[PDB]
Design a protein around this ligand. Structure first.
Ligand SMILES: COc1ccccc1S(=O)(=O)Nc1ccc2c(c1)CN(C)C(=O)N2
Ligand code: NA
Length: 124
């Protein structure tokens, strides 16, 4: 039932880059998912305590969320767009691993993932 430390959004010895694809990821891909009606459960690390998911971090070993991704993009944390896309991917996959098909949270993820894949297709 306890919360690990959240994923790092800074790392001084990690090599950083600003690519036009990273800037799109923040301006278009994240900005869009963030405003969606189903974004709220993914805007911060899962709080296993408040949300009574005491098995969450017993099951999910690579947690990720949009609050973390957003800060990482804001902190120029990534080397390339693929690293960032990978964090979105981890976020979705965790949801599908942890919860059951037909859970409301799964239908939420599923709608953001459809939207995500549509906005990523238009990646410059
Ligand atoms: C039943 O609780 C919920 C159902 C749908 C959406 C959100 C909630 S909750 O925020 O009250 N609790 C919740 C319940 C389950 C999850 C999560 C949150 C977050 N998450 C990423 C996950 O994978 N499972
Ligand atoms: Na650098």
């Amino acid at each position: 039932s306890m919360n690990p430390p959240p994923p790092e959004t800074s790392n001084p010895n990690k090599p950083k880059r600003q690519t036009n694809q990273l800037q799109y990821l923040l301006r278009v891909v994240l900005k869009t998912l963030w405003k969606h009606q189903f974004a709220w459960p993914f805007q911060q690390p899962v709080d296993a305590v408040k949300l009574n998911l005491p098995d969450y971090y017993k099951i999910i070993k690579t947690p990720m969320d949009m609050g973390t991704i957003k800060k990482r993009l804001e902190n120029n944390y990534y080397w390339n767009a693929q690293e960032c896309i990978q964090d979105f991917n981890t976020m979705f996959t965790n949801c599908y691993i942890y919860n059951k098909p037909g859970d409301d949270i799964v239908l939420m993820a599923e709608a953001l993932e459809k939207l995500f894949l549509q906005k990523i297709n238009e990646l410059p």
